[PDB]
Design an enzyme around this catalytic site. Structure first.
Site, mmCIF file in Angstrom:
data_model
loop_
_atom_site.group_PDB
_atom_site.id
_atom_site.type_symbol
_atom_site.label_atom_id
_atom_site.label_comp_id
_atom_site.label_asym_id
_atom_site.label_seq_id
_atom_site.Cartn_x
_atom_site.Cartn_y
_atom_site.Cartn_z
ATOM 1 C CD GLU A 156 -2.556 1.121 2.652
ATOM 2 O OE1 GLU A 156 -3.516 1.405 2.309
ATOM 3 O OE2 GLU A 156 -2.015 1.054 3.457
ATOM 4 C CG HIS A 165 -7.070 6.524 4.682
ATOM 5 N ND1 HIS A 165 -7.225 5.870 4.358
ATOM 6 C CD2 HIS A 165 -5.379 6.847 5.150
ATOM 7 C CE1 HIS A 165 -5.850 4.711 4.141
ATOM 8 N NE2 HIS A 165 -4.302 5.476 4.359
#
Ligand SMILES: *C/C=C/[C@H]1O[C@@H](n2cnc3c(N)ncnc32)[C@H](O)[C@@H]1O
Ligand SMILES: *C/C=C/[C@H]1O[C@@H](n2cnc3c(N)ncnc32)[C@H](O)[C@@H]1O
Ligand SMILES: *C/C=C/[C@H]1O[C@@H](n2cnc3c(N)ncnc32)[C@H](O)[C@@H]1O
Ligand SMILES: *C/C=C/[C@H]1O[C@@H](n2cnc3c(N)ncnc32)[C@H](O)[C@@H]1O
Lengths: 8, 343, 343, 8, 343, 344, 9, 8
Positions: F124, F281
């Site tokens: 990620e 987020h």
């Protein structure tokens, strides 16, 4: 029949 | 064993199943008066525990053994008959006190101890002091006590006082009068009303009350745990002659108890009196079947007779009369099945 | 020797039948107007199923259901009750002048002898969560006295289960258990027992009511047909479930309730303990997860509720649940005999 | 224990 | 070999002074009217301490305190700032026509070279809980430029600490840590990190305000006299305490605030961050216990707060507290550089 | 010494990895259900890309992605993490009884050594606006451990640009800076710093979300193919744009978001941070123009967004735009490393 | 990693 | 500043 009663 | 000879197995099974729960230990431990006073009594009398051998009867989670360790005890034998013994074992190891505290699972009337001890600690008080019949296991444990040994608690005082509580008395018939109707869904229940009344009056009432309902200075019946033998608790006759301080209808007798830890440095008192902060023992009241009118200055005399049964409790016989008038009342109660009325 | 004593510890049965010997406990059930009124409604409105019939009342208590059967025209009613309440029931039969129609047979239904087969069995064998007390097995066992094509009131029982969210209840029970998180309770480190404390507290089914808004999915139904089931079917009850989540949020556990149906010849009458219905003395039953599961609306929550009957007249329950989309699983154990009466 | 919960 | 660089990791100083290079951070401090107005009050009302005097302004930022010193009649003000805000301060000095009185000297006060000794040093070296940022040591270090007859503004600092009760705050932080209690987060068991998570969250000081009714005892005061203290006095700060509990309840932690006093020739002016006073951008600071201590009114809560300076311009704080009457003890660590801004 | 240290100032790196050492920061990411759920779905639904494969996890944090690869049947997973979170990952591997299959290797992927090549890389590496953190370069750097067959999850990344109108966001910048435009703040004239305060605010990218109705033209897309891109391709990122305005109004800046695609053997799964999708987020990012540009529906807004990598693990953003029909021009320079978090 | 001075309004 | 924004 609780030997020791519930308490707070 | 002594325990099994005086106890129905069915009663004992349920008794120790109750104490196998951590929530019941928590209920007692959170009683600050109870837990704090035991701690004060042990720590403030450290000379009675420093380098001494200690027996803890019915240790439960083992809290009193830890208090004896905080006071410098050399070795502590902690006996517990419920499955709570294994939990105490876990706490002994996690607190690094395996060298000082040895947990022995089983009944104190049946386990074997290696050596005699200098002092016995325990909390064998049930409501009205005598319920649970553990005071007899506490006295039975003196077979492991050195002749010069001590008992913590050292003495126990049960206090009896007459009370007036009109609402409490009338509450019994209000509940029983459920049965006094001729057509409950078409059924006539009135024939069982008398049996309902009798059923309620056999129950001691466990709760607290305002001290203003008391009508005479309490009468005190002392048990000296250092002197008494467990046979002294099979039949407890408590005579009383109350000097009435108030005029009114006496509806029954109120019960509470104190114990004293008579140490070498000081005596610490644990009280469940209604004038003191409330404890998990509360107080106990036994109603008369009929109230007695007494004037202030009169004497109310009689006896309270507690007869031990094999259900780890007592049958209570109360007889009272007003001497100046001869008015007489009584009641017979089963202490094993009280009514917890507190709200 | 009997079916009952072989599946029941004596200590459990002693206290079970002692509890039901108290008139106050009869009053407690009888004053439940939903319970008593619906029973009378099922019997009287299906009077054709009773007119000139032979009846068996399993666990009659005070005998109230037998009187209903008598009001509906039953020829003779055998009213079996194992507790001492059977004496009070007979007292009511005589005072209501129904000796010619209600015959009280003291004893356990698995041990008494009846003079003839019956056309219909009536009883209230439902404990909280339906299966507690294991009296349904006695209810089914009594079918040995039932004629072929005889009926049973109640005829079927439906158990409902649905997931719920209740952060307050979760925290209330977690706060209690965290007493054993204290590293210095009067100087004693209790933390070693926190895991055991959490286990004990979350094994307690929460018996109370709740607003229906906490349910996160339509309930799944599990049906017991009393006409067809054998008592051996209640020894190991496996309830699969596949919930389609209607709202997103935390699933703190499963809520349980039950309905029974009186399938008579005139009409079917339902007695429901659902949270959408007026409250009964059975309330509802919720089982808490030690850790809640997060689920989104549209997710499926699948698993199994496995009820294993024990010899204390109750069940040990295991609930395994997983969110299919994420693989988040929860495994829990309930001790149905140690409930938390929260109401 | 307590098989049937208190009510009202 | 500067005093600053020896006690400070470069990576810490880079981000530290980068933060103070932003005009938005100057505005945040300047708009604190209690802070700015009180500083101006202290300087203007003690104007004779500045009239025709030489002044050193440590960490002047945009230079507001230097302008206050000039308003009071200072002959020369050396304004020292290590961030890039020094260039903005120069701009304001020129646009306000004070090039003849305010001399911005960019750099760290431990490294710059002042042309002469000064009569008074002014600064705002207070971080939250007073000691954060370790700028008090730069303030004290600057006394190498102070005349023997010199004064310091602020002159002293008082740190106050008091026990508090706030169950909501405790559960809030504990609820965050409980995320790492999950045994099946997307099928992964996180519980092995429960302990590390609780430690991390409770090491965070809580920076916000609160109602004074949560305080359970009168505050203990720790005073630093900036006129007398030396840099080395702030490497290890030991603050013992002994509270006399005024209320019974759970002690969830200790609350911290501070006052500074400008002891001038004309009058003493106080700048307070106490919760009884109007709020400032310092707010107050609270350190949470992982397990609260229970204390009764009249008990004593004793222990020590130990602050060990670290090379990240802050302190590692250890708090040990003990309810003397019960031996209930709580040990805690807090990373003063990782605060939780709760407001 | 290493590729990482050559492109990163020490102070930036220290702060960067301290941040990721906190369990609360892992929790913040893990609780993003779009983020965590999509990675799990992308991995489990392409189980044949993981069954009995060797996996490298770049920046594993607590190790969640390694556990998904294990749930998918991977034989060996090397989980590399440079922050102190690596030690926590080792605890979870042990407590989950996966020490036979997951090996946590503490350190920077540019500096550690792997014992063997791998079949697939999972990571990620996306920061806000995709490129912040400069972790994509570590993701691409890790391809030295990838077998010629290798795949990468995510496989490609798309950044989207679109012009927006937001009068209130624009004016808010001067409301804040006008604090300095007063002649006697406690007797001090602050006005000389007003211009500097304005510049400071406009240099900040705005991290928050917004209603899609503020977008004035269809987005332009810039794609990074992780299977083919090289580290050097991310040092200078030029994104030409020519927006065909769908609405008339004042253009106050450009809005940014991104998607990534996990192109597996069974299916392609998409993780999108677009304002048309549930919030993540990463939110979205908006860069204001110093001056707004008026454009009519049908006009073209053309220009360039140039991202220049810096040694603070981020980018300097230069945006230039003009309305072709009128010639009115505007620009801005922004520091991606110090955004303004405006979400409330 | 935090701001030295807390945000204030 | 925080690489990953706060999120609820
Ligand atoms: C009131 C406290 C009771 C505790 O003592 C334990 N206990 C009762 N009776 C015995 C005997 N005979 N031996 C050992 N322990 C006993 C209860 O289990 C409870 O913990
Ligand atoms: C929930 C109501 C129970 C009533 O039925 C009685 N009861 C329970 N179990 C039996 C058996 N096996 N035989 C006869 N009666 C039974 C309870 O005493 C209560 O009245
Ligand atoms: C709380 C206010 C801090 C201001 O003072 C500056 N500052 C901190 N530490 C130093 C040193 N050692 N020398 C000069 N200025 C310093 C901060 O930059 C801020 O403006
Ligand atoms: C957005 C997620 C970042 C995670 O990856 C870690 N990380 C960043 N950069 C590196 C390098 N070069 N090597 C290993 N791990 C890295 C962050 O610490 C965070 O967990």
């Amino acid at each position: 029949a609780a030997p020791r009663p519930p308490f707070s | 064993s002594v325990f099994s000879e005086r106890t129905e197995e069915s009663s004992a099974v349920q008794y120790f199943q109750f104490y196998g729960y951590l929530s019941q230990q928590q209920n007692m431990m959170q009683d600050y008066v109870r837990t704090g006073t035991y701690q004060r009594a042990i720590l403030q009398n450290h000379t009675d525990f420093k380098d001494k051998i200690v027996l803890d009867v019915g240790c439960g989670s083992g809290i009193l053994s830890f208090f004896a360790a905080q006071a410098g005890a050399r070795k502590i034998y902690a006996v517990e008959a419920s499955t709570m013994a294994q939990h105490a074992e876990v706490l002994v190891k996690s607190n690094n006190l395996t060298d000082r505290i040895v947990v022995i699972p089983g009944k104190v009337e049946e386990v074997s101890l290696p050596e005699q001890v200098d002092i016995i600690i325990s909390e064998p008080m049930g409501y009205m002091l005598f319920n649970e019949r553990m005071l007899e296991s506490y006295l039975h444990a003196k077979k492991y006590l050195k002749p010069s040994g001590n008992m913590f608690p050292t003495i126990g005082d049960v206090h009896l006082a007459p009370f007036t509580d009109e609402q409490l008395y009338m509450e019994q018939f209000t509940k029983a009068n459920f049965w006094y109707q001729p057509s409950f869904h078409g059924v006539d229940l009135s024939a069982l009303r008398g049996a309902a009344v009798d059923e309620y009056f056999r129950q001691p009432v466990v709760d607290t009350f305002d001290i203003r309902i008391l009508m005479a200075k309490s009468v005190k019946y002392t048990v000296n745990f250092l002197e008494a033998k467990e046979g002294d608790l099979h039949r407890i006759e408590i005579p009383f002659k109350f000097h009435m301080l108030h005029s009114g209808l006496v509806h029954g007798l109120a019960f509470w108890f104190d114990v004293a830890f008579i140490g070498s440095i000081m005596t610490v008192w644990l009280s469940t009196a209604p004038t003191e902060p409330l404890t998990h023992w509360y107080q106990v009241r036994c109603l008369f079947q009929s109230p007695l009118f007494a004037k202030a200055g009169d004497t109310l005399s009689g006896t309270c007779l507690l007869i031990a049964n094999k259900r780890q409790s007592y049958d209570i016989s109360i007889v009272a009369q007003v001497d100046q008038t001869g008015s007489k009342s009584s009641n017979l109660l089963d202490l094993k099945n009280p009514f917890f009325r507190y709200t």
